[PDB]
Design a protein around this ligand. Structure first.
Ligand code: HEM
Ligand code: HEM
Ligand code: O
Lengths: 681, 356, 678
């Protein structure tokens, strides 16, 4: 149980009488009144202590990544990695460390949709026995900007316009694309956010990245540059935009329900922790500066080396106290890890400590149960708002004869203290510049686009098409075109069509290089466990009995099956009124249910008109495996789908089950999406 | 510093009354913790926690320190099975307002006419103090009102004191250079009541009271001061031996000593050498410091004493062994006298009364 | 200009160099570094003051009604109402008072969807010359509960489950329906939220209600009981749920952009302020207790009397400083108005003052520009976090000789002070009870349901059916049916069908057939179609675009907002098919020639998702909108199985389509397209 340490703060109210917050049993369902229909009395201490706690429930949302969800788990090291790092949690094979992980979007406020298009957060805390180590990462390996001082400018520009607070959780407005075109370093992360990375199927189907080059340091002080990677064992998987949009309305909690359900059902998700290791003298040797956070290091130059595995297997008990209150910091560093002179990471160290003072409104937030380390806190800090401890040492200063030297200094050789990488030097003039090695803003965006499949590339172009068409300002759109043209003339040409702007080549940064590991749709999933099948059935005839047997066999393969019908008859999990194709990864019509796709059975007061046809139509159009058993073939016919199309399965129950399970591995059937030039005559 | 008191921290078996001052306190103390602790969870701080257990549907708030199991944080509810459950007078030992309390009359922004006498009980309190105790009250008023720059306010103060006692107003008026006002007898009376006076009763114990023993590092005074100290400590007194520097057996230097720290001052034998001449002029303490400590202790009404030849120290400041609270002679006599004097604590014979 | 007083705090940065917050020109695009590829220096004071301010931008969202938007306007009194109230802002005909109104949902957090189904907030501040007067209302006339001490219970049950924080901005989960069924007083507001009031077309198409009975008070202390009403001059209008769900994802800002656009285009919305006025002796005369906020007073017993009109004509300049920071309070009361012993209102007075301490983290929030009164503040309050004034009066206490008695006490006779209604009394024992006159939780829900049209009733049935089907606990669903059965046996039976349960036997205790006016939405056509939106589906190929432009020009002549849609942003094209959705429009019209993108080659362009033009037209028809097609474009209507002789479907020449669409927009929703049980 990764939550074991939190059990001392858990409160059980079952079997108990109601109390105030200072004790004493009470009733709190009637205000104290001066007479039968009289006014409420100020001496009603019960009312006020009740409503005061309610009135003060909210704390500021996170300034970014306000929307997200998390879970507890265990990290297990695959070996003794002291040859590369002194970090304790990596010091022995099969050594286990508790973790908490929070995933998130970035721009939207607390109650915005999971399936907005956005960069996604992927923040892991390791509760190591030498302190909390945080890897505060994203599901994309590159960030928009090169210097942390520019973070408010980026965030202001993609967050809602400050006059009307429009639009929510979206980059598709004037100010965002004004910034992307004015600050071309942003183009690389922009392409990633315009790909499947922007609309992932779930948190469990994302990779994770520390983005920054960090340093691993051994006991003797020798260092190596490092990039952190999380590789999902569930496979990467993404939606399509026209489906993500409907899902934002039909279920804004899609991703957080996904993670909660996967953990409750015993299908805990896993990721492997992998590193790229670079010699210090090769920091600038791979065609870019490894201090530049707008670049990633191609795996052909440095392959991933797995260090261990993280498994998330316990949901929180109280979302607010755990998920909402947890405070990640890239400054949460331990012996064996060190920073680099990456100017984006540099400012992050200041900003995450500072922002906690706003969110928690006091300096003792590390005393909150979810933030406490498991290794012990011993220093001369005192007082502060909400101080939760009572310190015994009355000589709270160093150096000191009276306290005998305790708590005592720890460094590289004594007490396993933290130490900065010994060989690090500063050289040159104090400056407010960036190294000219950071200058190339276009080569790697082109490398990323080059490495996606043709339909994947079309998804990127179609996302830009959708987004830039929202830009009202003409010049901003032309500014966006000119910047895109620097990455790829063809990309600029195909975007220009949607904007009604004119298509010339600017080849300075053009190239044809590709690299592995950035595509989503060029590889099928390694497992279909926890994937969802919506079985469309009906309450008339024998369809339900067949749907139950269909559900039974599908569940044997680890699939979550929802049988749908007009009302909640025995064996029905959901009504047509409450169902939508966005909730499922495949849609199967049970035999006999073809009656609700036309004629009388399709017009009923119990669900919106055409709803079963719409669920099947959405499912097909969005690339899902779709199927019909037996006579339900007619339902496929009524929407114009042919039985032998890719990802379409008709026949008896056994072949449908087999075909659907195979199609779930492919996950999305990309022959259903037109590519530029397909429609030409 | 963190503890958060509230008059609204009430338990079963106690209730409020319609005291209009109490009524508003209940609001003010809850609300003010939001400022001092900037959050609603201050009752979770260790010093504020009850020992009896907290079970309700409150959640969240800044600094939420617990993790609640019950996900049905509302009442009434079928899903939590009725828990946490309501408690009242009959079940669950719940709090309840007094059953017989009634409201009657108009909603008003007024105070009952029964509140209108502001002078009788001030007069009753002053009546029930000793004569020098009374003089302490008048001298406090004389000191305080003398700082008031505005003439009319001073006359306003006198007009109001005259409604309590004409003699109080007369005696305060002298310090202010203001005329004795004419009697306003409406609230005058001569009644007395017990339990409000301080100086009319000696102390039930002298344990922990403090004795400053003024000594000197020259001669054999410190050995005698140590013997004096050990006997006084047998009665539970805290004894500080004072000398020019921190020699063996010295607790404090003259430079750091002051009469305000002690409940009795006694000069050890031989220490009269620091009350005049060369021993009173030393770089190790401010000029006159030993004489100032004895003078202060005498003038502030403490038991003061000197052993043997140290009586000369009492002479040097004009004090005579005749006096109440002044003791001289050999060690055992001074010990018994000082210990008796600490029961009396303050010797009010040394404070002049108006027209005495 | 309603925002005139705010102009002295506005800050223009055009033409200026960047500065710190303490002055001094700066550059703030590069961190200070030790060497070319060096670490950032702690002495970079420029970096830290810029990032500290960014790091601390957020304040806590409102504990309820977190999601909302607002605007400035003017309220105009139609008369001298001194005969019923001493309130100054109602004291003369044509007297004008600045207002700010915020509209909202209730349950969702700050980024939740506008078209979630919920009760809606309707909060109005009058900046009167005798202080700020707030009417903190909802778009529904009754509330869920009868005593304020139960508000955390209601809100906890409606808001997301505390283990996983699911679901966002929705009552469709176990805990809410557990509460609705455990606390039957909630059924009346529940029914309202299950009707069109829960999914309004816009803020401008809602009525508003103070809900509580208040008191109007004249200068001589005479009082009348009062209900506040806001009547929209735009007409009430609602969506269908299946449409609101899609709109929640396609545009979460649907309502805040609608109000922004209407104001910006010169189509300022208006509401009339109206009252019901009854004597003190009528408090228990109409079969319920007027202190009970779960009941409304039927207009047949006390008609609406209009007092004036409010018009919202100025958008905020900075959303955060104005809309986010504004702090409403039912305690914001002025001379001429008083409270009643409504146990729900009573506790609100404490709660809204207290909660501002959390949201603004200090006691001086009334000093913020959007919160300041226009009538002047003179008292002995001092200090506090963020104290923004410098007080001259050094004798900050009363009573006092030295301040000469200033600031002076004001009451009923001196200085136009506030005064509690002089005749109010208290009688009986102190009690933690409710009046037995509060006992009936079912009659008025039945009255409400009885007063809706038959399809309007099905919408309520289908909302309950949708909601209750998400409840996983079997017994909670049974408890729901037992409580619905006390309102209407028919409602329970029709709801039970979707739940696969057996409805209980009839329970005739509270059944009745009475109806009341003014609670229905769909029984009345709209009084104006100004600001209503038409999507024109065209194409870039052929001559369709030119006809769509001519169709757009004629439609705009009737005050409509027209969006021409095509494959890409050609000349005259407002929006691409990729970006378009039927939820954005009040009517959908296929321009002549655009039938070519509903079938064949033209429907398969990579520039938009497959079937997108046909889905837009399909959505518009099934969601009940006026739909049409000009000339050859009627092939598009035939491609989705719709024909011209249907209500709200129009075909023919341009002149015929425009006239038909515009009259159909008055009907707004064609209810003949929705099946009714049976
Ligand atoms: C590679 C670049 C970055 C990555 C991968 C990243 C990642 C993240 C993540 C995952 C979170 C949310 C953690 C959670 O779930 O609670 C977060 C929050 C935050 N980020 Fe970043 N971020 C980056 C850049 C920056 C920069 C440059 C700044 C400012 C200089 C910044 C300031 C913040 C702040 C203030 C928060 C709120 C923290 C809190 O309220 O607890 N981030 N970031
Ligand atoms: C007839 C009953 C009620 C009505 C009409 C109502 C209406 C409203 C409205 C419109 C708002 C949003 C104001 C804005 O736009 O900023 C609001 C917020 C709020 N309500 Fe109520 N509500 C009711 C019941 C209650 C009750 C019973 C309580 C507690 C006793 C309560 C506590 C609050 C609080 C604390 C806020 C947040 C105010 C702020 O943060 O500025 N409400 N309510
Ligand atoms: O509220």
């Amino acid at each position: 149980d990764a939550r074991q340490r939190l059990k001392e703060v858990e409160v059980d109210d079952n079997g108990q009488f109601m109390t105030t917050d200072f004790g004493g049993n009470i009733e709190e369902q009637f205000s104290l009144k001066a007479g039968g229909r009289g006014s409420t009395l100020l001496e009603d201490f019960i009312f006020r202590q009740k409503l005061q706690h309610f009135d003060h429930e909210r704390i500021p949302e996170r300034v970014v990544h306000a929307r997200g969800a998390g879970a507890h788990g265990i990290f297990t090291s695959y070996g003794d990695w002291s040859n590369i790092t002194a970090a304790s949690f990596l010091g022995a094979k099969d050594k286990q460390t508790p973790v908490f992980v929070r995933f998130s979007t970035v721009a939207g406020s607390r109650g915005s949709a999971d399936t907005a298009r956005d960069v996604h957060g992927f923040a892991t805390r390791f509760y190591t026995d030498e302190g909390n180590f945080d890897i505060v990462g994203n599901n994309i390996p590159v960030f928009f900007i090169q210097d942390a001082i520019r973070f408010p400018d980026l965030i202001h520009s993609v967050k809602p316009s400050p006059d009307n607070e429009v639009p929510q959780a979206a980059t598709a407005h004037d100010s965002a694309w004004d910034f992307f075109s004015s600050q071309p370093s942003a183009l690389h992360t922009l392409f990633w956010a315009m790909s499947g990375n922007g609309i992932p199927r779930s948190y469990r189907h994302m990779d994770g990245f520390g983005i920054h080059t960090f340093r691993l340091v051994t006991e003797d002080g020798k260092s190596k540059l490092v990039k952190w990677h999380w590789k999902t064992k569930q496979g990467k998987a993404a939606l399509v935009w026209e489906e993500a949009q409907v899902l934002a309305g039909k279920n804004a909690d899609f991703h957080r329900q996904d993670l909660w359900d996967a953990i409750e059902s015993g299908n805990a998700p896993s990721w492997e922790l992998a590193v790229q290791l670079i010699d210090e003298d090769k920091a600038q040797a791979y065609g870019f500066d490894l201090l530049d956070p707008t670049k990633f290091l191609p795996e052909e130059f440095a392959p991933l080396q797995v260090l261990g595995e993280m498994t998330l297997n316990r949901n929180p008990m109280n979302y607010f106290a755990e998920t909402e209150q947890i405070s990640f910091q890239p400054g949460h560093i331990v012996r064996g890890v060190d920073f680099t002179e990456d100017p984006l990471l540099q400012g992050r160290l200041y900003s995450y400590l500072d922002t906690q003072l706003n969110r928690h409104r006091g300096p003792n937030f590390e005393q909150l149960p979810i933030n406490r380390p498991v290794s012990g806190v011993h220093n001369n800090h005192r007082d502060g708002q909400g101080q939760a401890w009572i310190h015994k040492n009355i000589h709270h200063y160093s150096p000191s004869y009276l306290n005998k030297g305790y708590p005592a200094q720890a460094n590289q050789t004594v007490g396993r203290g933290f130490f900065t990488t010994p060989g690090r030097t500063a050289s040159g003039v104090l400056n407010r510049e960036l190294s000219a090695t950071f200058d190339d803003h276009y080569t790697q965006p082109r490398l990323f686009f080059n490495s996606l499949t043709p339909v994947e590339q079309q998804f990127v172009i179609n996302a830009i098409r959708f987004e830039a068409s929202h830009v009202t300002n003409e010049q901003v759109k032309k500014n966006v075109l000119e910047q895109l043209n620097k990455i790829s003339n063809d990309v600029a040409k195909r975007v220009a069509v949607a904007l009604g702007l004119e298509a010339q080549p600017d080849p300075t940064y053009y190239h044809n290089n590709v690299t592995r590991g950035v595509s989503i749709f060029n590889e099928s999933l390694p497992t279909i466990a926890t994937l969802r099948v919506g079985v469309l059935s009906t309450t008339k005839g024998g369809s339900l009995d067949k749907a139950k047997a269909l559900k039974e066999q599908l569940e044997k393969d680890g699939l979550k099956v929802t049988v749908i019908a007009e009302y909640l008859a025995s064996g029905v999990d959901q009504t047509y009124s409450a169902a939508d194709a966005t909730a499922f990864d495949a849609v199967v019509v049970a035999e006999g249910a073809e009656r609700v796709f036309s004629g009388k059975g399709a017009m009923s007061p119990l669900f919106p008109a055409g709803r079963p046809s719409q669920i099947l139509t959405d499912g097909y159009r969005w690339g899902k495996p779709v199927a019909a058993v037996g006579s339900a073939k007619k339902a496929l016919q009524s929407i114009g789908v042919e039985e032998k199309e890719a990802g379409v399965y008709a026949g008896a129950q056994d072949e449908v089950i087999k075909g659907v399970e195979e199609g779930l591995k492919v996950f999305k059937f990309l022959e259903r999406f037109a590519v530029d030039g397909d429609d030409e005559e | 510093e963190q503890i958060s008191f509230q008059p609204g921290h009430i338990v079963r078996g106690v209730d409020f009354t319609e005291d209009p001052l109490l009524q508003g306190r209940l609001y003010s103390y809850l609300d003010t913790q939001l400022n001092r602790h900037r959050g609603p969870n201050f009752e979770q701080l260790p010093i504020n926690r009850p020992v009896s257990g907290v079970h309700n549907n409150h959640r969240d708030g800044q600094g939420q320190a617990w993790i609640h199991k019950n996900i049905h944080h509302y009442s009434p509810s079928y899903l939590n099975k009725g828990y946490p459950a309501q408690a009242n007078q009959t079940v669950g030992r719940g709090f309840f307002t007094t059953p017989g309390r009634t409201a009657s009359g108009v909603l008003n922004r007024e105070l009952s006419a029964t509140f209108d006498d502001h002078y009788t009980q001030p007069r009753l309190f002053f009546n029930s103090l000793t004569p020098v105790e009374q003089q302490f009250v008048i001298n406090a008023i004389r000191f305080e009102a003398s700082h008031v720059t505005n003439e009319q306010v001073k006359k306003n103060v006198l007009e109001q004191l005259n409604k309590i006692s004409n003699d109080v107003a007369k005696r305060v008026a002298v310090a202010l250079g203001l005329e004795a006002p004419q009697p306003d007898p409406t609230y005058y009376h001569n009644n007395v009541t017990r339990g409000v006076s301080i100086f009319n009763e000696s102390l039930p114990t002298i344990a922990t009271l403090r004795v400053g023993v003024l000594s000197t590092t020259k001669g054999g005074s410190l050995d005698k001061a140590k013997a004096l100290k050990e006997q006084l400590e047998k009665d539970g007194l805290k004894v500080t031996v004072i000398a020019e520097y921190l020699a063996s057996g010295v607790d404090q230097t003259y430079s750091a000593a002051d009469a305000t720290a002690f409940d009795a001052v006694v000069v050890a034998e031989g220490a009269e050498r620091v009350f005049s001449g060369k021993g009173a002029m030393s770089p190790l303490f401010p000029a006159g410091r030993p004489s100032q400590i004895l003078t202060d202790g005498y003038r502030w009404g403490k038991p003061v004493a000197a052993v043997g030849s140290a009586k000369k120290a009492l002479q040097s400041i004009g004090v005579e062994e005749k006096e109440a609270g002044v003791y001289a002679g050999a060690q055992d006599e001074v010990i018994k006298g000082v210990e008796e004097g600490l029961k009396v604590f303050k010797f009010l014979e040394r404070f002049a009364v108006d027209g005495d």
